[PDB]
RNA sequence: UGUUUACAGCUUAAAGAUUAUUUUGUACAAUAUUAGGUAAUUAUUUCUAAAACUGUUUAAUAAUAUUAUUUUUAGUAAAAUAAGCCUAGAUGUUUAGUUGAAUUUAGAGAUUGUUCAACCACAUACGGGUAUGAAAACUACCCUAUCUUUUUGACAGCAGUGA
RNA sequence: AGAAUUAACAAAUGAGUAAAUUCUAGGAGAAGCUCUGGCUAAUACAUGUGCCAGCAGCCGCGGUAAUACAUGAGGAGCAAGCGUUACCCACAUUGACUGGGUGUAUUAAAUACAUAGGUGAUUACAAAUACUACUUUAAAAGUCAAUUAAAAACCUAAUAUAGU
RNA sequence: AGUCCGUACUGUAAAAGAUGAAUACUUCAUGAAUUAAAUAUUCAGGGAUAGCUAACGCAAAGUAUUCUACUCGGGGAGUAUA
RNA sequence: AGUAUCCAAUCUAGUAUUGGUAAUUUGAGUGAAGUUGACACAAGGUACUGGUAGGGGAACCUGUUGGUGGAAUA
């Protein structure tokens, strides 16, 4: 064994770090990363007193945290601390990783004419939709587009598949 | 708001018992305060007595930090060498002389006095103060021994 | 069993998780036929058999074997790859591989014999038990988790709990009750 | 429980129509007689009531003789008579339209009898002790 | 163009006390004879608007040639991208002012939340809105609406009257 | 019961009032209410009534022999209250942390896998915590075992939280 | 008719051991079974008892620990209504 | 000043949901010395009963599976 680990929170347990009370600072675990920009979901456990049963209780809770470098992943165990809300549902940020979790970088490194198809299909529906149904609801503004493009692209791919057909039917008729 | 020192009541009907509090001027005088400082109990009992209590260590905070008493408290704090006395209505340097002060009521204090032997009480006091002198003159012969 | 359910509760509309990547089953089935056509039984090698005659080889050949024997080769074929120490048999990397070879059989057994209700309950256990060792192995040797899921055509979906309760859960924070 | 909306809801109340209140006033529609159960045998008087809350009701008449008729204002006690069914309430005497029981000089508090002028010998100290 | 260390009163700036507003965590009733709810919704970036402007040097930042960069609030009556957020009793319905604490009790607890006190709310109406001020609507003021007597008024201010 | 005087809340000004003092008369000059079968302390007394009239908090009385009704006497208890009703708490382990039960006493739902959550093996080591003593915060009022055997009062403990 | 088979619904009962799931330890007799010089124990109710229990009764319904659920008298009533 | 936008009360209609009231109808408990018959507790005179299906002056009868909260047969 060694001697210099004796304050590392891993060998030490989580006891060594001294956290402020009242939800100022906390200990927890990340659940999501990369699904949104500069945000990570986190889980924490509480322990308070309940006198009628004369035993502590527990409570899980979820928070959303501000990560500036998009640096953390799920298993990374991390301290978080209170900040004023820069946005809704974000009043916490990260202070420090206590225990890391390995990354997926070594595996990530290994991992055009349609742009004239795409830009038409957009302009198709904005001319139709705006006349038929106005802005009224954002749900309609989004549920259409995401559901209309696949209806459009398999029709716009079909517009370009004709190009391979027309050019060759000339050469077949011009050659022979 | 500004900070004020003034009274506040806790005593009941026909039995006043005031307090001293550091509170601002805008809140309910019967409400909250920032620091209980002192008392003002005028009545007597076998246990409680007629008092003016204060905590100098905190009156010297708020006055040093921004505060101002009322008229009564300015009087009560005069005797603690923190403030001056408030001025009389018509004014000092004009008071006329009055007859001498006399005690009306002895307040119902019962120090050690013997009952049903009123005639001979003067004898009791000689015998008690003679013994003062004896132990004095007789405590000397120990001090030589030590 | 485990479903996409970000809250504490588990609904009806929530969908089960994905066992395989798209077209994961068929790729594995193709690998077997390649083995079945060119391999012998588990214990035996081609080098040991070259003096002996063909009639001895065709018997030992794995075409003629039973599916209970077809796995035994595939298992030991995996153990030589995904072991930690020699004569390893029970470590997590192998235990997941065993269930993947069973799922190939249970589905074939259940697609065909649909009324074997006892089997329909047995899938739900294999998946769940696979879903545990598949998680416990992420946590310990993450760079072996990925070297498995590629071979067996498995998706890389982390757990929604975030490995919270097994790893380094401690000192759970203080609050107070009132009223 | 639904009529009860305080305290232990699990407790079945001891006077449901009368409810949380200690007493309640009403008006008679009609008087009646009801027999007791089989072990006993008698004709115990009964007095219907409509309450101010518009609720039908039955009630007991403890006194021997009674002034009761139709259109009589009455006040309920809530206690009841035991042998009778549906008579778990009881009226109060010495009030709006009852009468003190008569030729009676014992238990003068239940029945509303004031104190006679013979037994009392001295006045209250607020006037001429 | 008397004196602002003669007294009172007023203006302006700074330092500090206190106060008002803004922020979070946990606690906080029953019910599934209510389970999907949210749609500028969830996150980032951008744009616009207000915050005194310009330069010099230094620091620091990413590349590194040394140039460029450095902040906060609000708005979807600003837009784009990606698709998420709550559901670990969201939402919805019902009931109810919360608390210190009062009654009881050996103690834990149970039931209630009257007097006084703190905070929040209302002031004929679950109503709409403004001026002043460090802070407001409570006997402020304007409008609508209900009821009532004088074009006022709404006693949940004290006393008092009716029901 | 009656009459009188004073202190103090203003050593200029009191609306109103001493749980203070003295004096005279005279010598308790303030009593009711419930109950009388058992639970429940108190009568096998008297009369009439006869499953009628009526009592009744619960059990239950009354059918000619009524300590249970009504009359009368005697007697018991509480006491400026006594008694009745309505709601709440305790007594109750009658809602179970302290502190129950679940084979037969109208209580384990038909059953298993399983999520959230709860829970949990050995040694060695660190770290922190509990326990002890001290200390921080938790408005006053109210409660609280205030102490030198003391009323008109100002227990500093408990519990919870941070910390040595 | 149905009773039987196939496809699918229906989803209740005295659904029973009327006894929630798991672990450790625990009596005497009678008896069932491996078969052991690789490896030593498992099981039963048709008996009784310690101990527990209101009693009848149970080798767990016993001693000890961990989690979940139900239970606030009876009738109305496993019914009305939605 | 004023045009144009945003917005409240009141009013209209239907829809959704929850309550109040009613011709008429129906159920339950309770009381009493009633009539008809004899289902049930004993093997209740044909062992009772659960789930279900059909039948039916009433209490009830029969099939099909289960249980003992039934006796009896050596
Ligand atoms: Mg207590
Ligand atoms: Mg209140
Ligand atoms: Mg009041
Ligand atoms: Mg008041
Ligand atoms: Mg009014
Ligand atoms: Mg005000
Ligand atoms: Mg008034
Ligand atoms: Mg004076
Ligand atoms: Mg005298
Ligand atoms: Mg006796
Ligand atoms: Mg007689
Ligand atoms: Mg209790
Ligand atoms: Mg069971
Ligand atoms: Mg179960
Ligand atoms: Mg788990
Ligand atoms: Mg306090
Ligand atoms: Mg059985
Ligand atoms: Mg069975
Ligand atoms: Mg059962
Ligand atoms: Mg026991
Ligand atoms: Mg038992
Ligand atoms: Mg036995
Ligand atoms: Mg056994
Ligand atoms: Mg048991
Ligand atoms: Mg019931
Ligand atoms: Mg029943
Ligand atoms: Mg049924
Ligand atoms: Mg039903
Ligand atoms: Mg209906
Ligand atoms: Mg009708
Ligand atoms: Mg019969
Ligand atoms: Mg029969
Ligand atoms: Mg019949
Ligand atoms: Mg029988």
Residue whose tokens read 């004009």: B94
Contact A95, A81 (CB under 8 A): yes
Residue among C160, C168, C174 minimizing CB distance to A47: C174
The CA dihedral of A139, A145, A151, A157, to the nearest 10 degrees, is: -170
The SS3 of residue B69 is strand
Min Cα separation A51/chain C (Å): 9
Contact by Cβ (8 Å): D4, D78: no
Query: Distance (Å, rounded) from C-alpha A124 to C-alpha A76?
Result: 47
Mutate to test the interface with A, among C168, C176, C177, C179 (most CBs of A within 10 A): C168
**DSSP-based three-state secondary structure for B105:** coil
Q: Which residues contact A140 (CB under 8 A, 6 or more apart)?
A: A133
Phi-psi region of D104 (alpha: psi -120 to 50; beta: other; left: phi over 0): beta
Distances (CA, A) of D57 to D17, D28, D32, D50, D129: 8, 9, 12, 6, 47
Report which DSSP code applies to C80.
T
Nearest to A146 by CA among A122, A124, A175, A171: A122
Distance CA B81, CA B79 (A): 6
Here the contacts of A19-26 (C-beta below 8 Å, separation 24 or greater) are A19/A79, A19/C173, A21/C174, A22/C175, A23/A82, A23/C173, A23/C175, A24/A81, A24/A82, A25/A79, A25/A80, A25/A81, A25/A82, A25/A95, A26/A79, A26/A80, A26/A81, A26/A92, A26/C173
Angle of CA points D41, D42, D44, to nearest 5°: 140
How many A/C residue pairs have CB atoms within 8 Å? Answer: 70
Q: What are phi and psi of A95, to 5 degrees?
A: -105, -40
The bases of strand G with some atom under 7 A from any protein CB are 7-8, 72-74
Q: Can you give the three-state secondary structure of chain A, one letter per residue?
A: CCCCCCCCHHHHCCCCCCCCCCCCEEEEEECCCCCCCCEEEEEEEEEECCCCCCCCEEEEEEEEEECCCCCCCCCCEEEEEEEEEEECCEEEEEEEEEECCCCCCCCCCCCCCHHHHHHHHHHHHHHHHHHHCCCCCHHHHHHHHHHHHHHHHHHHHHHHHHHHHHHHHHHHHHHC
Residue given tokens 């509760």 in the structure block: C9
Extract the tokens encoding C88: 């390893």
User: Which phi and psi (to 5°) does residue A146 adopt?
Assistant: -60, -30
Chain H nucleotides near the protein (CB, 7 A): 30-33
Phi, psi of C158, rounded to the nearest 5 degrees: -70, 165
D6: left (phi over 0), alpha (psi -120 to 50) or beta: beta
For residue D55, what are its two tokens? Answer: 């609720």
| Header resolution in angstroms | 3.7
Instruction: Please report where in the chains the tokens 């509309």 appear, as a residue.
Output: C13
- Pairing assessment for the beta strands C173-174 and A39-48 based on DSSP bridges: parallel
Provide the token pair at C169.
Answer: 């859960």
Query: Buried (b) or exposed (e) across D69-83, using 16+ Cβ within 10 A?
Result: eeebebbbbbeebee
The HSE-up count of residue A169 (CA atoms within 13 Å, CB side) is 5
Q: What residues in A contact C161, CB-CB < 8 Å? A: 31, 43
Count CB-CB contacts under 10 A for residue C20.
Answer: 17
Tokens of D32: 């009646």
**Residue D57, class by beta-carbon neighbours within 10 Å (0-12 exposed, 13-18 middle, 19+ buried)?**
buried
Strand pairing report for B35-41 and B18-24: antiparallel
In the DSSP assignment, the letter for residue C50 is S
Asked whether the beta carbons of C168 and A14 are under 8 A apart, the reply is yes
Contacts of C163 in chain A (CB under 8 A): 29, 74-75, 101
Q: How far is CA A146 from CA A117, A120, A139, A159, in A?
A: 16, 15, 11, 20
- Looking up tokens 């050469």, which residue turns up? A171
Question: How far from A170 is each of A163, A164, A165, A176, D109, CA to CA, in Å?
Answer: 11, 11, 9, 10, 124
Resolved by:
cryo-EM
C9 touches strand E (CB under 7 A): yes
**Residue located via tokens 């055009």:** A112
Q: Which of C136, C109, C139, C137 is nearest to C122 (CA)?
A: C109
What does the alpha-carbon distance between residue A86 and residue C172 come to, in Å, rounded to a whole number?
Answer: 27
Tokens 């649909």 identify what position?
A: C114
Give alpha helix (H) positions in chain B: 56-65, 71-78, 121-138, 140-143
Torsion of CA B110, B114, B115, B118, to 10 degrees: -120
Backbone angles phi, psi at C58, to 5 degrees: -65, -30
Alpha carbon distance D48, D31 (integer Å): 6
> Which nucleotide lies closest to D37 by the C1' atom and the CA atom?
H31
Give the number of other CB atoms < 10 A from CB of residue A67: 18
Distance CA D50, CA C136 (A): 76
Residue B65 burial (CB count, 10 A): 8
C171 near A27, Cβ under 8 Å?
yes
Compute the distance between CA of residue A20 and CA of residue A80 in angstroms, rounded to an integer. Answer: 11
Chains C and A touch (3+ CB pairs under 8 A): yes
What's the burial of B74, exposed, middle or buried (CB within 10 Å: 0-12/13-18/19+)? middle
Q: Is C51 helix (H, G, I), strand (E, B) or coil?
A: coil
Q: Is the CB of B107 within 7 Å of strand E?
A: no
Nearest to B11 by CA among B43, B35, B37: B43
Cβ contacts of residue B62 below 8 Å, gap of 6+? Answer: B3, B5, B22, B35
Q: At what angle do helices C117-140 and C92-112 cross, to 10 degrees?
A: 160
**Cβ atoms of residues A97 and A76 within 8 Å:** yes
What six digits make up the tokens of C145? 């988790």
* Pairing outcome for strands D31-34 and D44-47: antiparallel
Give strand pairing partners of A28: A44, A78
Q: State the Cα–Cα distance between residues D54 and A148, nearest whole angstrom.
A: 66
| Distance of alpha carbon A30 from alpha carbon C161, whole angstroms | 9
By the 10 Å C-beta count (0-12 exposed, 13-18 middle, 19+ buried), D98 is classed as: buried
User: Which are the contacts of D29, defined by CB distance < 8 A and separation ≥ 6?
Assistant: D48, D49, D50, D70
B18, containing H or E segment: strand B18-24
* Cβ–Cβ under 8 Å, residues C92 and C133: yes
- Rg of the Cα trace of chain D? 18
Cα(A71)–Cα(D41) distance, integer angstroms? 93
* Rounded Cα distance, D2 and B36, in Å: 50
Q: How far apart are CA A118 and CA B83, in angstroms?
A: 86
- For chain A, the distance separating the N- and C-terminal CA atoms, rounded to the nearest angstrom, is 86
DSSP-derived secondary structure for chain D:
--S--SS-TTSPPS-TTTTTSS-EEEE-S-EEEE---SSS---EEEE-EEETT--EE--B--SSS----SS-EEEE-S---SSSSS----B-SSSTT----SS--SSTTTS-PPPPTTT--S--TTS--
Nearest chain C alpha carbon to A21: C174
Which of A101, A103, A108, A111 best probes binding to C when mutated, by most C CB atoms within 10 angstroms?
A101
Is the separation of the CB atoms in B68 and B2 below 8 Å? Answer: yes
- Backbone phi, psi, residue D49, to 5°: -150, 140
CB contact under 8 A, A30 and C162: yes
Residue of chain A nearest C159, judged by CA positions: A31
Please give the distance, rounded to the nearest whole angstrom, from the Cα atom of residue B101 to the centre of ligand 8.
Answer: 13
Compute, in degrees rounded to 10, the torsion defined by CA atoms C101, C107, C112, C117: 120
Question: Which of helix, strand or coil describes residue B35?
Answer: strand
Query: Which alpha helices (H) appear in chain C, and where do they start and end?
Result: 24-37, 46-49, 54-60, 67-79, 92-112, 117-140, 142-149
Sign of CA dihedral B33, B37, B40, B41: positive
């Amino acid at each position: 064994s060694s001697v210099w680990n004796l304050l590392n929170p891993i060998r030490n347990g989580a006891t060594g770090l001294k956290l402020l009370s009242s939800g100022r600072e906390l200990f927890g675990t990340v659940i999501q990363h990369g699904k949104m920009d500069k945000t990570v979901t986190v889980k924490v456990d509480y322990r308070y007193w309940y006198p009628k049963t004369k035993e502590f209780k527990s409570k899980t809770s979820k928070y959303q945290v501000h990560d500036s470098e998009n640096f953390c992943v799920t298993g990374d165990k991390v301290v978080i601390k209170s900040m004023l809300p820069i946005s809704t549902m974000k009043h916490y940020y990260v202070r420090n990783i206590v225990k890391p979790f390995p990354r997926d970088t070594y595996y990530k490194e290994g991992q055009e004419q349609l742009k004239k198809e795409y830009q038409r299909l957009y302009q198709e529906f904005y001319e139709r939709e705006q006349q038929r149904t106005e802005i009224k609801n954002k749900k309609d503004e989004v549920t259409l587009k995401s559901a209309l493009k696949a209806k459009a692209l398999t029709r716009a791919m079909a517009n370009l598949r004709k190009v391979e057909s027309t050019q060759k039917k000339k050469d077949k008729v011009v050659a022979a | 708001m500004r900070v004020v020192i003034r009274l506040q009541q806790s005593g009941f009907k026909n039995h006043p018992r005031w307090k001293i509090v550091v509170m601002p001027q805008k809140k309910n005088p019967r409400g909250r305060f920032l620091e209980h400082v002192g008392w003002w109990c005028p009545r007597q009992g076998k246990i409680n007595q007629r008092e003016i209590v204060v905590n100098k260590e905190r009156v010297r905070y708020w006055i040093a930090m921004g505060a101002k008493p009322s008229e009564k408290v300015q009087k009560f704090l005069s005797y603690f060498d923190l403030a001056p006395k408030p001025l009389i209505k018509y004014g000092f340097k004009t008071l006329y002389e009055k007859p001498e002060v006399t005690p009306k009521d002895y307040l119902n204090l019962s120090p050690y006095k013997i009952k049903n032997f009123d005639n001979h009480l003067h004898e009791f006091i000689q015998q008690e103060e003679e013994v003062k002198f004896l132990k004095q003159q007789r405590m000397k012969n120990e001090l030589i021994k030590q | 069993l485990m479903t996409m359910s970000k809250s504490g509760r588990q609904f009806a509309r929530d969908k089960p998780l994905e066992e395989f990547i798209p077209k994961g089953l068929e790729k594995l089935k193709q690998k077997e036929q390649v083995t079945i056509n060119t391999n012998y039984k588990a214990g035996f090698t081609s080098e040991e058999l070259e003096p002996y005659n063909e009639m001895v080889k065709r018997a030992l050949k794995l075409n003629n074997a039973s599916p209970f024997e077809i796995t035994q080769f595939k298992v030991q074929q995996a153990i030589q790859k995904f072991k930690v120490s020699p004569r390893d048999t029970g470590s997590a990397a192998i235990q997941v591989a065993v269930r993947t070879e069973k799922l190939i059989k249970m589905i074939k057994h259940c697609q065909e014999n649909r009324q074997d209700k006892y089997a329909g309950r047995a899938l739900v256990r294999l998946l769940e038990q696979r879903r545990k060792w598949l998680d416990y192995l992420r946590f310990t040797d993450y760079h072996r988790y990925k070297w498995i899921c590629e071979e067996f055509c498995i998706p890389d979906q982390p757990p929604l709990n975030g490995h919270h309760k097994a790893n380094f859960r401690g000192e759970p924070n203080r609050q107070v009750k009132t009223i | 429980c639904i009529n009860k909306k305080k305290g232990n809801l699990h407790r079945k109340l001891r006077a449901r129509i009368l409810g949380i209140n200690p007493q309640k006033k009403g008006v008679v529609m009609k008087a009646r007689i009801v027999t007791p159960r089989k072990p006993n045998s008698a004709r115990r008087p009964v007095a219907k009531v409509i309450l101010v809350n518009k609720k039908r009701l039955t009630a007991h008449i403890p006194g021997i003789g009674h002034n009761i008729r139709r259109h009589s204002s009455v006040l309920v006690r809530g206690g009841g008579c035991r042998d009778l069914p549906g008579v778990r309430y009881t009226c109060v005497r010495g009030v709006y339209d009852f009468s003190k029981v008569l030729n009676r000089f014992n238990r003068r508090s239940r029945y509303g009898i004031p104190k006679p002028d013979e037994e009392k010998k001295k006045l209250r100290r607020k006037f001429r002790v």
